Design a binder for this molecule. Structure first.
Ligand SMILES: O=C(Nc1cccc(-c2nnn[nH]2)c1)c1cc(-c2ccccn2)cc(C(F)(F)F)c1
Ligand SMILES: O=C(Nc1cccc(-c2nnn[nH]2)c1)c1cc(-c2ccccn2)cc(C(F)(F)F)c1
Length: 263
């Protein structure tokens, strides 16, 4: 079947010229709304949530792990390092790296999280351990954002990412203190006001993680606390056929607005 919401999302996608993927979980009733929910999309920096969460899981058995200093060398800097560049020839703790990766989208910080987990496959292994059979991280920053159409590397589906984001932030994939820390970090994101949040009523509270890459790829994954009702989890992924396409955060906002109107 095609619902009214799905037909609106299809119209939005048609006008946009690109390929749109949406997954909503409404935790009030556990119902789901999907659009291309089982197609693969490049995650780009939305993958930083999985890396930070994997380190939070490690910290459940190491009380001092988040305070461990990690060296930042000049050679570690990649292509977007607003926080890590201030620490070159010094150190950042794993908490600081997690916060920088999540709230500023720092790519050097992400690479330190990946290294702490033993490489991209350590992030995938954590995903499997929490029941996500779809997520795959194959590369480090910045090349995990190449976003080439048809490339399976560094992709997931909207359905899988919404389920995982729910388990991480609202369910029991992490210990209680770690879940709360992840939610605090997401709610303090600096990069998200033009994405999912721009399509929602202003009274609603949002924590989110954005992503973008080549092929005009523009992504956001969010946990949403609407005024007076149980939380929602929403994934909006968007990618375009030409390498040099411009970012389209407005398409994510428009998808979120359609979703909110259908509640
Ligand atoms: O840093 C970013 N993108 C990047 C980095 C390095 C090289 C190249 C590159 N290479 N060739 N063309 N661009 C592009 C980046 C872009 C954004 C954005 C904002 C507004 C509209 C579109 N996108 C937002 C954010 C953040 F972190 F604030 F969410 C980071
Ligand atoms: O690293 C990148 N982008 C980035 C960095 C940090 C934060 C965020 C972010 N966070 N939230 N939203 N965007 C995005 C990146 C961008 C590109 C690109 C090319 C052409 C046009 C646009 N982009 C290409 C590549 C590579 F290496 F794969 F070719 C990497």
């Amino acid at each position: 079947q095609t619902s009214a919401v799905q037909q609106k999302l299809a119209a939005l996608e048609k006008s946009s010229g690109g390929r749109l993927g949406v997954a909503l979980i409404d935790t009030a009733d556990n119902t789901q709304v999907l659009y291309r929910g089982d197609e693969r999309f490049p995650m780009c920096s939305t993958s930083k949530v999985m890396a930070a969460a994997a380190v939070l899981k490690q910290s459940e058995t190491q009380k001092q792990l988040l305070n461990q200093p990690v060296e930042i060398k000049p050679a570690d800097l990649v292509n977007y390092n607003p926080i890590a560049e201030k620490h070159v020839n010094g150190t950042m703790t794993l908490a600081e790296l997690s916060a920088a990766a999540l709230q500023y989208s720092d790519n050097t910080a992400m690479n330190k999280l990946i290294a702490q987990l033993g490489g991209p496959g350590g992030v995938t292994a954590f995903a499997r351990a929490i029941g996500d059979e779809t997520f795959r991280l194959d590369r480090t920053e910045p090349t995990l954002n190449t976003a080439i159409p048809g490339d399976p590397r560094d992709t997931t589906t909207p359905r899988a990412m919404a389920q995982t984001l729910r388990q991480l932030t609202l369910g029991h994939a992490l210990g209680e203190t770690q879940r709360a820390q992840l939610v605090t970090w997401l709610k303090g994101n600096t990069t998200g006001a033009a994405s999912i949040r721009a399509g929602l009523p202003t009274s609603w509270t949002v924590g989110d993680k954005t992503g973008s890459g080549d092929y005009g790829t523009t992504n956001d994954i969010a946990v949403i606390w609407p005024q007076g009702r149980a939380p929602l989890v929403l994934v909006t992924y968007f990618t375009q056929p030409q390498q040099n396409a411009e970012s389209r955060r407005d398409v994510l906002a428009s998808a979120a607005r359609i979703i909110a109107e259908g509640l």
